[PDB]
Amino acid sequence: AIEKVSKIFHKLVGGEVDGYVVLNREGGAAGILTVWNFLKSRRWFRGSGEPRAIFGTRVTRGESKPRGVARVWRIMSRGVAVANPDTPITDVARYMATFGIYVVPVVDRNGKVIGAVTAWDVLHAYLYGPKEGREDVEV
Amino acid sequence: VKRTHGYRYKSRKLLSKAPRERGMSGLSRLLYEYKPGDKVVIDIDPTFISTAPHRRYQGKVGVVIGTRGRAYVIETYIGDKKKIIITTPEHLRPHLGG
Amino acid sequence: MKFPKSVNMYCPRCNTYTQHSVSNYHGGQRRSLAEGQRRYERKLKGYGSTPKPKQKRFAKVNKKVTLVFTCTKCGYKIVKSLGRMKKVELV
RNA sequence: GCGGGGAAAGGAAACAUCUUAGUACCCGCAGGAAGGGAAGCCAACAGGGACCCCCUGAGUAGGGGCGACCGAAAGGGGGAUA
RNA sequence: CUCGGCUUAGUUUUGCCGGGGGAACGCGCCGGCCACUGGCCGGCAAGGCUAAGCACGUCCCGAGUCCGAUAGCGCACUAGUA
RNA sequence: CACGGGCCGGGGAGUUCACGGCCGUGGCGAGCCUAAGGGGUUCAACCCCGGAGGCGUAGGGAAACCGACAGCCCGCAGCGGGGCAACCCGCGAGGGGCGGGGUCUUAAAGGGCCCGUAGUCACGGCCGUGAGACCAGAAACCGGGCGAUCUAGCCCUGGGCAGG
RNA sequence: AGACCAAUCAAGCCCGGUGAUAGCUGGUUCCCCCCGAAGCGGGUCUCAGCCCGGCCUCCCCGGAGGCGGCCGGCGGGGUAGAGUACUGAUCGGGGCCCCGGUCAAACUCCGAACCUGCCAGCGCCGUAGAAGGGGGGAGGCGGGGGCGGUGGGGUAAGCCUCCGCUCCGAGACGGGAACAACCGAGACCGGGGUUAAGGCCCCCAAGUGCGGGCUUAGUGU
RNA sequence: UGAAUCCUGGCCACUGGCGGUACGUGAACCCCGGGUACAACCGGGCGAAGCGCCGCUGAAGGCCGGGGGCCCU
RNA sequence: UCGUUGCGGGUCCGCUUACCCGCCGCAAGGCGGGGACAGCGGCAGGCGGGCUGUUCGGCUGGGGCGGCACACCCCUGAAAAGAUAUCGGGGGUGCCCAAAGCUCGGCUCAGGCGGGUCAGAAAUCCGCCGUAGAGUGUAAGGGCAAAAGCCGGGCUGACUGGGCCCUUGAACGCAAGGGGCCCAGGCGGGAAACCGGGGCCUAGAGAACGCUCGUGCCCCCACCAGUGGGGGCCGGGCAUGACAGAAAAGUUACCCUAGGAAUAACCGGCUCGUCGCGGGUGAGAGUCCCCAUCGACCCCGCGGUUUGGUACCCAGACGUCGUCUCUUCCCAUCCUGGCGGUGCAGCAGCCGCCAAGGGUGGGGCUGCCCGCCCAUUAAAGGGGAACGUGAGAUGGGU
RNA sequence: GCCCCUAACCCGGCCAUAGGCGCCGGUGCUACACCCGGUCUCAUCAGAACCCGGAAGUUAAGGCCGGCGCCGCGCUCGGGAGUACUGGGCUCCGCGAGGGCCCGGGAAACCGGCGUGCUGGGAGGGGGC
């Protein structure tokens, strides 16, 4: 949760992940971070640009520089519902279809994050079934 | 990205065999007896790669200096530097050309 | 990885193979009379910054597995390393 | 010349231990010189014989992020001799 | 002896300062590169003085493969002057 | 259309010491050289003395400790023999290889280092490292002093502000 | 207001440490003669530096072989092409098979030119000293142009990044209108002669040169 | 904080401050044991503030979003 | 906590004379309060940017963010010897396994077919075919069929002491790491040959100093001997992933110095994807009718006018937006001159060609440029000139 | 002993011209087999295999030899083809990517034709020394 958004910004905009699970100090799910967090709010944004055309004048800072970078928990989605291994896949599918958020954290009995369910995982269940070397537990 | 240098690092073509050479090789190369002064050609056998010399010595002609148990001690050159190759006869052929 | 608690091993002193008991290596306690420790305590006295380097960033995930093989016949000890991997389970 | 207080720049190709350096500088106190000087010494079972200064021992022993670098003493030859 | 600190090549071993503890007495005490024990060897701390032989240059004398008025001391001259 | 110089005169940049490596010469040679210092002088020169010490003459090993060649082969120069010459043959310093020896490690074998002669002192040169180190150049940091006639603040004691 | 503290203030001034340090910038003074580079590889808090090799130079030892070329004998190779047979891609026809077709940097039954190892010869260099070895001093460790690998990337670039010959840097001179690296060609000094590239209507040395054909646009030169 | 006037909401998780019985941790001194003809050395005990832990504090620095059914989360 | 710290009585009580605080006094000393506390000095722990010194890595199609192309491995690039780069392409590594290690023997895999009780697509059984279409821990490539795969028997060589070579590191200096061949000691499997110093091969990897452990009838510790302790040689480990090894966070628009056209911003150069403009094609629209007017799907171009790409010149300096003023040039022509077509009755409109002599204005809004709008107008075109022109101005924006 | 000639058997080299499918023949004193048994050595669920002891039966099968056909494979053969590609030179063409000329090398697929194991040592058999 305390990471700088510049650390993960390129992985989201470039589409290398569909979202982030944000962890607190104890390894629990603090929240969810997707591109929609960056579209809803601009608390993360700071303008940039190439150096200015400084000629014939006394200007001491010709290029804008980013100095205070926002932390992840400042713009994340707080209070998302988490899933368990025995959670029904149809409740996850309903959430993803309704809100368009394609990452859901998965926690153990103590609330510690052990993984996530992506929209690609949900499609896999609806199209083929369990992943290789996995078994469907009771719901 | 720079070239990696494992012991066999550009040897796909060299260590590949045509279908008609698949399987074990014949045993006649085992039966040549080399004496000091003999000329040999280093011809790597890919079915015994662990005892084969480095790819840079393929096709080079060496001189037998002596024996070490079952391997032959061969004196050869890489460019201008003298190199000592110790290898078993399955990676050697007699050089008939002088 | 599992490893036996007893192996048949060459003993250099007995000049033969004998049964050897196996145990983990444990580093002994640094003694204050060690010459390097005496020099350090001297260097630590008086004013100044912290006098010696102290590593902060570590990179190894596992240590080298070191085992002490004790000859059951004469007590000769061979401490050998099995390479870098997680702690073995002596079975 | 004697006693005390006492840096940093720079060097270590960064830098803090370290060095620079007990230096620069400051405070006090003497003389035509000052200080030192008459074995609770050094040595090794053989013997030297107050002290200071010069040549050597020697960049040796030793100190040191055992790194940069720092660095004796006894002994020997002299000046002079109480 | 112990603790802190400055220093020293002095290193489990240099000197000292400060805080705390603190002897013995010639049948005693101290030293011999960690401490102790035995032997052997060497000495007598914690009081004072001491010529000569050694440092320096305002000054005096001599010398010079030194410079020769933008040089040589800042100053060859009514220069530490205007 | 990269920067520096208006012009002329004068000035203006690889130095010295210590230590090390190497070279060119010179002296002496299993030895080489004296240092400080001393005596004399026509008085810093010069003559003589001074061998302390340094380097060399033996290495191996952390240390205790131990402690070394003329045997064989190849062969350049050179010399000798033969030949018109070409070249062949013999001996063969130096050079190269082996063998042998000292020592360390090891149970040993093997392996490491070393061994069958040349050093030392000086003068000049080149280069390295330190010293300011070819000459010019920071912003800085530290020591001890000087400053509140300016200005900032405050204190003590004086002065001023038409008319509506 | 980080204002002001004697024209000095994100920490005064004076003198001292002090000739602070500077991998950075500027400067570095007479003549002739001999040879003559480099911007590559590896390591580095390394990327404007430095060290070890490559490349230069000087000296010495050594002592007969050496190789930027060619021919042959005996070997190595898997690229161009080819193929669609292994691994994949792909369009059709006919009954999972057969036939035809389109493809492959990370496919290969085949397979050159070409490069390369040893030996013998040729050629050339070498006793006026090959190979090999020791020692002193470096510079340099920013390269660039042409041509070739559809090199690989990129819309492309006087672009980025490799491989090879040559040239500029460090190379005068003729031609290219000018012009480091395109063509010709390598310069001690003076003179005579003949050619190279290229040119020969004038500028401008040499042809208003010779035969045939085409163009009517001053196309073009 | 910035005359006056009407007002000044919810939040002590965080960063701070402060208060606190017990418990864990927490230095030197000190005590006990081993060791050493003596020491060095080794183990244990005791254990201050503090920290952990529990509370108070927003006119302390400040913060004030979602989901679900006024309620839950 | 040690000292100051004393005196009586049974850790507690008291006391005062120490010490501390105040009053009076010139001083002497007196009075009151506290009191062995406090205060003060040493030592120890905590809080401690109040203050001092420093570090805040590199590569980089400028820097920054990211990535790790920073240490390794496979295929490709790589051009049939060797070497070979890019923030080139596709991936992987910081493990795991007492077996997944050694050896001996037997056997044959994926898949298909025939038969067979449950029994089934798939269980065990009989037979046939089956070149590997399986398996071989783990990337990729290579190898492997009486095996290198599968099963079973016996084992620990994932061994002690050493040497040589190959690669890392081409020819050509140079770590660590990895691999190969052996000699000696002593074993395992096997009839024997032979093989075993881990894993079928190519990756899984760490200097000095310090510490620790193993080892030796081991060496040394200052005159001699002894006890404790210390040091030494050889080997294993504890770590530097920025991987040939410092121990290290920001911020400066208040900023300063050395430099750099080795490197960005403006203009210029190159390029033209983008931008603007032109052409080919003709599905389709146009009542009929491709081409009066258009022009899907595609394709060939030009300009240098937007934006970008690149980094060649310029950092001891080319004054950074717009506007004002003033001059000139281009034509891809808005009007004015000429001509043609029309889905041109007229009035108007639309489209093409020649043509740059002249014209192309006044206002509202915004710092603008651009654009929208108002009233006119023959029409109220667009571009270039160091984004013309700040040693001419202006200075609203940046 | 020695030399020479020579089937099937034993040990090999090269590892398809040797392999695969189908059809037609040859071979049996000896040699190779199929074959007969399981006391012994050895072996398993199983004397099937392995191992041991044999010799009644048979050339039906294997092995070896000859022929034909197809597939596969091979070839210093014809064509494909001096084609594709390529080392060196060029003020030669093209707007350009690219092509061309000269000197020197030179494929592959495919079509046709031919081929369908060769060979070393030994035993056994024959002839001589």
Ligand SMILES: [Mg+2]
């Ligand atoms: Mg700035």
Ligand SMILES: [Mg+2]
């Ligand atoms: Mg490389």
Ligand SMILES: [Mg+2]
């Ligand atoms: Mg292996």
Ligand SMILES: [Mg+2]
């Ligand atoms: Mg200095």
Ligand SMILES: [Mg+2]
């Ligand atoms: Mg420094």
Ligand SMILES: [Mg+2]
């Ligand atoms: Mg610094």
Ligand SMILES: [Mg+2]
């Ligand atoms: Mg005196």
Ligand SMILES: [Mg+2]
């Ligand atoms: Mg005196």
Ligand SMILES: [Mg+2]
């Ligand atoms: Mg000193």
Ligand SMILES: [Mg+2]
């Ligand atoms: Mg006395």
Ligand SMILES: [Mg+2]
């Ligand atoms: Mg003067």
Ligand SMILES: [Mg+2]
């Ligand atoms: Mg004059």
Ligand SMILES: [Mg+2]
């Ligand atoms: Mg300049």
Ligand SMILES: [Mg+2]
């Ligand atoms: Mg000028």
Ligand SMILES: [Mg+2]
């Ligand atoms: Mg220097």
Ligand SMILES: [Mg+2]
């Ligand atoms: Mg400083």
